[PDB]
Ligand binder design. Structure first.
Ligand SMILES: CC(C)CN(C1CC1)S(=O)(=O)c1cnn(C)c1
Lengths: 300, 237
């Protein structure tokens, strides 16, 4: 179990750690988060009390270094930084643990939610979507645009998700226009899985990371990406059975975790109705169809 | 984006554009089977691709053999239309390729866009106009070449005959749409108007009769009357 300590908490802020969140008051004596499960990526995120504009946060994996948070009063945000001096960092944390000024990552032992949401997510792939190679952790916020969004402006602050476009030459083989547009299996399996992602685990990883950035930061382009990757599978007549089974589990836990109140903006009616009711895979997503129908019957 | 009454003069500017109408591509007669079920029999069809500025009509004849052994024909017909329009564009010299293609039915947008990916600068547009191009098979010489075809075939016409020697393309398009609207609303009466007088003939190289300017005004009035008439017989007004 690992620890992300905080130098201080100078501004009132709602702090998130994965799917958990708690309120810290202005100059409350908060010095971080302990007992963070090893083995998973994590995201620690922030929404300032005074300006809910810009949710922002850091993806990290404690196996890759010792990270802490210091509020920067010049740039006005909580920054993640990596301490190289192991002994100095551990000693402070040791001592901080003694004065009990840390919140405990509150994992219920029965609960596999976070694992289920991050099953295929790997820091190494996050760091290729979010390019900032001098840090082991990745910053994301509400406003960051995707490469694809920019094609339709600051390249270094972009989310470099894999571009998916159903009406593109990449998606459509010359001479198979109708075939490839109505059955995207070529684009899914040859172009994307064999070609770009190499395997379904990397595809699901990017899909899950997109969803999580949409949910935690309201990042609209991430939501576009999450729906595109869903629609590409559902619109393919030929999908490995193990992918369909895993997809159903992935989406089930994403729908289960989504705040009920945010469904209006995070869920694309067209894509979901199409995927659950009209697409080739309309009958292959039993768990997701059941939770969507019991929880968001309005959308459909 | 969409073409409508507000940007109607754009049709006659000097940017090459084509209308594409697919309503006569897949055509059937519905009939009873021996067992009392219903079956369809395809008949020859055509893609109606028209430059509204010049009158040039690219009539691609769709022979019934293209449907043989195929499923979901109404959906295939949109993609076959798109394929043939794309092949037509590639066959044209660059300076003759359209800058816009306007489809008369919105269902053609994705099929044509996908077939035209190689031409990203050709704008594919819908229209809010209710154009009467389905009635093109009420033009006898067009109907005749479609029904007689025994193989896929492209036939080129000028749907304005020689009218552009005397009128503008705006006026010629208006005349065409009025004639086609009339033929669509009441083909028999429309054709009676057009041919009642045997002294006015159709030149072998034309589609419509050789009316003088004064006779065209009479004809055009008769066709309006007919449309308003039928609109009365229809609604009882
Ligand atoms: C929350 C604490 C872990 C933050 N520090 C960690 C050990 C690096 S610090 O020692 O107070 C510190 C703050 N700024 N600098 C340069 C060092």
């Amino acid at each position: 179990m690992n620890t992300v300590p905080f130098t201080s908490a100078p501004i009132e802020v709602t702090i998130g750690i994965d799917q958990y969140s708690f309120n810290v008051k202005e100059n409350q004596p908060f010095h971080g988060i302990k007992d963070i499960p090893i083995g998973h990526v994590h995201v620690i995120h922030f929404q300032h009390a005074d300006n809910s504009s810009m949710r922002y946060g850091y993806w990290f994996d404690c196996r890759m270094g010792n990270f802490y948070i210091q509020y920067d009063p010049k740039d006005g945000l909580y920054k993640m930084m990596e301490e190289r001096d192991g002994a100095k960092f551990e000693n402070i944390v040791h001592n901080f643990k003694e004065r009990q000024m840390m919140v405990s990552y509150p994992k219920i032992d029965e609960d596999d939610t976070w694992y289920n949401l991050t099953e295929f997510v790997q820091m190494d792939k996050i760091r290729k979507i979010v390019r900032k190679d001098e840090n082991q952790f990745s910053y994301v916020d509400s406003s960051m645009t995707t490469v694809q969004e920019n094609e339709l402006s600051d390249p270094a602050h972009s989310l470099n998700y894999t571009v998916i476009n159903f009406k593109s030459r990449e998606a459509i083989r010359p001479g198979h226009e109708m075939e490839d547009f109505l059955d995207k299996s070529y684009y899914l399996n040859t172009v994307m899985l064999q070609g770009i992602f190499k395997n379904s685990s990397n595809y699901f990883g990017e899909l899950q990371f997109a969803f999580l950035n949409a949910m935690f930061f309201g990042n609209y382009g991430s939501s576009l990406q999450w729906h595109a990757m869903i629609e590409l599978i559902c619109s393919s007549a030929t999908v490995p059975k193990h992918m369909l089974d895993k997809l159903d589990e992935i989406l089930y836990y994403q729908i289960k975790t989504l705040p009920e109140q945010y469904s209006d903006i995070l869920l694309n009616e067209r894509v979901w109705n199409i995927c659950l009711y009209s697409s080739f895979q309309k009958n292959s997503l039993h768990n997701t169809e059941k939770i969507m129908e019991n929880k968001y019957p309005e959308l459909l | 984006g969409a073409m409508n009454s507000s940007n109607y003069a754009e049709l006659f500017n000097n940017d090459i554009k084509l209308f594409v109408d697919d309503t006569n591509v897949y055509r059937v007669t519905v009939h009873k089977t021996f067992e009392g079920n219903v079956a369809t029999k395809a008949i020859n069809g055509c893609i109606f691709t028209l430059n509204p500025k010049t009158g040039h009509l690219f009539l691609k004849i769709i022979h019934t053999s293209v449907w043989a052994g195929q499923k979901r024909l109404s959906q295939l017909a949109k993609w076959k239309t798109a394929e043939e329009v794309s092949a037509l564009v590639r066959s044209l010299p660059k300076e003759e390729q359209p800058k816009q293609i306007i489809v008369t039915r919105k269902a053609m947008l994705d099929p044509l866009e996908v077939h035209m990916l190689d031409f990203p600068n050709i704008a594919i547009r819908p229209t809010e106009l209710r154009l009467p191009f389905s009635a093109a098979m009420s033009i006898d010489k067009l109907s005749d070449v479609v029904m007689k075809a025994t193989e896929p075939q492209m036939v080129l016409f000028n749907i304005y005959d020689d009218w552009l020697d005397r009128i503008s393309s705006y006026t010629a398009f208006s005349r065409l749409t009025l004639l086609l609207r009339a033929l669509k609303t009441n083909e028999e009466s429309a054709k009676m108007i057009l041919l009642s007088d045997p002294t006015i003939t159709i030149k072998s190289y034309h589609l419509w009769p050789s009316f003088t300017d004064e006779q065209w005004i009479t004809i055009e009035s008769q066709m309006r009357d007919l449309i308003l008439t039928e609109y009365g017989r229809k609604y009882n007004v």
